[PDB]
Amino acid sequence: TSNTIRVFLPNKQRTVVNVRNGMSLHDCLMKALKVRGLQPECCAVFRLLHEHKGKKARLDWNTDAASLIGEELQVDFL
Amino acid sequence: MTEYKLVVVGAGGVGKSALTIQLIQNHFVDEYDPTIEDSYRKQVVIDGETCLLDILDTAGQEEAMRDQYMRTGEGFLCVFAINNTKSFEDIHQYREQIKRVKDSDDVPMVLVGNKCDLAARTVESRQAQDLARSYGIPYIETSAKTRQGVEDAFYTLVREIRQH
Numbered sequence: 221t222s223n224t225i226r227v228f229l230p231n232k233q234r235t236v237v238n239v240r241n242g243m244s245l246h247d248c249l250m251k252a253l254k255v256r257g258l259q260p261e262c263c264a265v266f267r268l269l270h271e272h273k274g275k276k277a278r279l280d281w282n283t284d285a286a287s288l289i290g291e292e293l294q295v296d297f298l
Numbered sequence: 299m300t301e302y303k304l305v306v307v308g309a310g311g312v313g314k315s316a317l318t319i320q321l322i323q324n325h326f327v328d329e330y331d332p333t334i335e336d337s338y339r340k341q342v343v344i345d346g347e348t349c350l351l352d353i354l355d356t357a358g359q360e361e362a363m364r365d366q367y368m369r370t371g372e373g374f375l376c377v378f379a380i381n382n383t384k385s386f387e388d389i390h391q392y393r394e395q396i397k398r399v400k401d402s403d404d405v406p407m408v409l410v411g412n413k414c415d416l417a418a419r420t421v422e423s424r425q426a427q428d429l430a431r432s433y434g435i436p437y438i439e440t441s442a443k444t445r446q447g448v449e450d451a452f453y454t455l456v457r458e459i460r461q462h
């Protein structure tokens with residue numbers, strides 16, 4: 221069983237989070253951002269679209285994380 | 299500036315993440331959240347030299363993708379827990395794995411005995427010293443909980459790369 225999301229973080233960092241029932245995107249990336257000295261309310265998170273190279277679609281932080289299982293995300297600065 | 303790619307390897311639950319996060323954020327992670335893949339970056343000054351540390355925190359439990367990052371890494375932090383005999387015994391396999399991928403017996407490594415704040419010691423310091431001596435690398439005891447030896451472990455690894 222693999223309910224995970226690969227996330228490309230700023231400063232060329234990366235993390236793979238685990239998704240559990242009821243988690244928002246904010247709730248599953250909270251810890252990963254904090255320990256790297258980043259606040260969620262200072263970053264834009266995007267989904268990298270399939271069948272392309274650079275296709276980037278902006279997400280809402282309150283998005284259910286289960287919707288993004290198996291996908292690759294990217295967090296940037298503002 | 300100089301960029302050092304460090305890889306943290308070892309059995310599950312020895313405190314690889316706790317050590318890394320303690321180094322990066324000065325925070326002790328009390329919970330046990332198993333790692334899949336985590337990379338951290340930090341700018342530090344080591345021995346008068348502005349350094350960029352790129353640290354890869356690996357998964358202890360299985361998972362292959364190991365060979366991939368073992369070719370990238372310039373320095374390896376081999377972690378076991380002093381209250382976990384099995385984890386200490388697993389170190390050899392990690393060393394062999396690193397030895398195969400890089401096709402060398404001269405890879406910059408540091409042996410780390412973590413959780414030295416606990417009294418449930420089953421791995422003696424002398425045992426780990428002997429293991430490290432056979433590899434030609436230093437041995438350092440750490441506690442991610444009390445910050446003891448944490449900076450020293452990582453900085454020693456940088457200084458071992460410099461020798462190679």
Ligand SMILES: Nc1nc2c(ncn2[C@@H]2O[C@H](COP(=O)(O)OP(=O)(O)NP(=O)(O)O)[C@@H](O)[C@H]2O)c(=O)[nH]1
Pocket residue numbers: 308309310311312313314315316317327328329330331332333334356357358359412413414415416440441442443444
């Ligand atoms: N007492 C004590 N507990 C520690 C120490 N370091 C880590 N721990 C605890 O040991 C557990 C495992 O920590 P963790 O860093 O996740 O280990 P890991 O090697 O990263 N695990 P994984 O391989 O699955 O990612 C956590 O509950 C953590 O709080 C230490 O120095 N002392």
Ligand SMILES: [Ca+2]
Pocket residue numbers: 403404405433434435
């Ligand atoms: Ca050696």
Ligand SMILES: [Ca+2]
Pocket residue numbers: 420
């Ligand atoms: Ca004994």
Ligand SMILES: [Mg+2]
Pocket residue numbers: 314315316331332333355356
């Ligand atoms: Mg971990």
